[PDB]
Design a binder for this molecule. Structure first.
Ligand SMILES: Cc1cc2nc3c(=O)[nH]c(=O)nc-3n(C[C@H](O)[C@H](O)[C@H](O)COP(=O)(O)O)c2cc1C
Length: 362
C-alpha cells in the first residue's frame, strides 16, 4: 500500500495520499460571506487528511456566484479563516485554500450593485447557481447572462488573484489552489465554447491560456511557486463548458506551461458528477512526463483505483469529495478497511450542522 505513505507537496509534507477535495457547502454567514465556527469544526474533524483543500473561496466580491460561499478578500474573512487554519494546525493537519472567480456562473442579485456578472464573452452559462431565499435556505436560480470583460479590466482580475493569495498567506493556509476548472472564470477563458474573444485572450490555445498563466505567474511572484497548486478539468464537458475539439493537445500545452513555473501541484478533475469517458493510461503518461510536481487525481475514485494509479507512477495522491463529506476520518477508515457512513446528499449544500458536522468518526 502507498496511500498511507508521505508525499512532499511543495512547501509541506503530507503524511498520506488521501486528500480532501474542494467541496462547496454554502454555509457561510451573509452579509459578508464570512467563514463560521461551524465551518472551523468541520475542517478540524477532517484534519487527518493528507491535505485538506477548502471549498471554493472568492478572490473578490465580484467573484461571487453562490450564496453562502466564503470570500478571502475582506478583513473579517481573513480573521475568520485565521481561526479555521489554526484549528487544522492544532490537529497537525495541512490546508490549502481553493480560490475562484465564478465568472458567468453567477447571478446579478449577488453581484456588486446587482449588475451582470463578468466573463470572457457575453454568453449565458445556461445553467443554475444556488442562491438563498428569505429564510436563508438554498434555492436554484438560472444564471444571468454575463458582460464580456474589457481588455483593460483583465489586469484587475490578475491583481485580485494576487491579492487573495497574499491574504491566504496571512490567513495561515499552507498552500493555495487556483480554480481553473468546472466552467468558472479561468476555464471560461480556456474553452473555445465560452471564449469568443478576438483580442489576445481568445482564439489560439496560447491566447486562451494567457489569463490563467498570467495568474500563475502573479501568484508565484507574490508568495512562492512551492505554495501554488492548480485545479483543471481539461478533458470532457463541465457545466456546459467543453474543452473543445483539440482538448488533449490543448491540455498538454497548458500542462507544459504550468511545469515551467515549478508549482507545487497539478490537480486534475477527471469527470464531472454526471460522468465522462475515463482517462487513458497513455494520456496519463503524457501528463506525467510534462509535469514534475505532484499530480492529484479526482473523480469517483476508489481507494483501489488510487492505489493502482499511484503504484503505476501516474499520479501521487487522490482527492475524495463525497466520501470526505460523509467520513471525517476517511483516512483511518480506508486504512482499516472499515465501512463508510452513508451519504445524505440533500444536505450537501446549505443548511447547518445537520449533514455537515454530524457524520461520526469511528
Ligand atoms: C457538494 C459538492 C461540492 C463541490 N464543490 C467543489 C468546489 O468547491 N470546487 C471544486 O473544484 N470542485 C468541487 N466539487 C467537485 C469535487 O471536488 C470532487 O472533484 C468530486 O466530488 C468528484 O469526486 P468524488 O466522487 O470523490 O466525490 C464539489 C462536489 C460536490 C459533490
Amino acid at each position: 500500500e502507498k496511500l498511507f505513505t508521505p508525499l512532499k507537496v511543495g512547501a509541506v509534507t503530507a503524511p498520506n495520499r488521501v486528500f480532501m477535495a474542494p467541496l462547496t457547502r454554502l454555509r457561510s454567514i451573509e452579509p459578508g460571506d464570512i467563514p463560521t465556527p461551524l465551518m472551523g469544526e468541520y475542517y478540524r474533524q477532517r484534519a487527518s487528511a493528507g491535505l485538506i483543500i477548502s471549498e471554493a473561496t472568492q478572490i473578490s466580491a465580484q467573484a461571487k456566484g453562490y450564496a453562502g460561499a466564503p470570500g478571502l478578500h475582506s478583513p473579517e474573512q481573513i480573521a475568520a479563516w485565521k481561526k479555521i487554519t489554526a484549528g487544522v494546525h492544532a490537529e497537525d493537519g495541512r490546508i490549502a485554500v481553493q480560490l475562484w472567480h465564478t465568472g458567468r456562473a453567477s447571478h446579478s442579485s449577488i453581484q456588486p450593485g446587482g449588475q451582470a456578472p463578468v466573463s470572457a464573452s457575453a454568453l449565458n452559462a445556461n445553467t443554475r447557481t444556488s442562491l438563498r431565499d428569505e429564510n436563508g435556505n438554498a434555492i436554484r436560480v438560472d444564471t444571468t447572462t454575463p458582460r464580456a470583460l474589457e481588455l483593460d479590466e483583465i489586469p484587475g482580475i490578475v491583481n485580485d488573484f494576487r491579492q487573495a493569495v497574499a491574504n491566504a498567506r496571512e490567513a495561515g493556509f499552507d498552500l493555495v489552489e487556483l480554480h481553473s476548472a468546472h466552467g468558472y472564470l479561468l476555464h471560461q477563458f480556456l474553452s473555445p465554447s465560452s471564449n469568443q474573444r478576438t483580442d489576445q485572450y481568445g482564439g489560439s490555445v496560447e491566447n486562451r491560456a494567457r489569463l490563467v498563466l498570467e495568474v500563475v505567474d502573479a501568484v508565484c511572484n507574490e508568495w512562492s511557486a512551492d505554495r501554488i497548486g492548480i485545479r483543471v478539468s481539461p478533458i470532457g464537458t463541465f457545466q456546459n463548458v467543453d474543452n473543445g475539439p483539440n482538448e488533449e493537445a490543448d491540455a498538454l500545452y497548458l500542462i507544459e506551461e504550468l511545469a515551467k513555473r515549478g508549482i507545487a501541484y497539478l490537480h486534475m478533475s477527471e469527470t464531472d458528477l454526471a460522468g465522462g469517458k475515463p482517462y487513458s493510461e497513455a494520456f496519463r503518461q503524457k501528463v506525467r512526463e510534462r509535469f514534475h510536481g505532484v499530480i492529484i487525481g479526482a473523480g469517483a475514485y476508489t481507494a483501489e483505483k488510487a492505489e493502482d494509479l499511484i503504484g503505476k507512477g501516474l499520479i501521487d495522491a487522490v482527492a475524495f469529495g463525497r466520501d470526505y463529506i460523509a467520513n471525517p476520518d476517511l483516512v483511518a477508515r480506508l486504512q482499516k478497511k472499515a465501512e463508510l457512513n452513508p451519504q445524505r446528499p440533500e444536505s450537501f449544500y446549505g443548511g447547518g450542522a445537520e449533514g455537515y458536522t454530524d457524520y461520526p468518526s469511528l
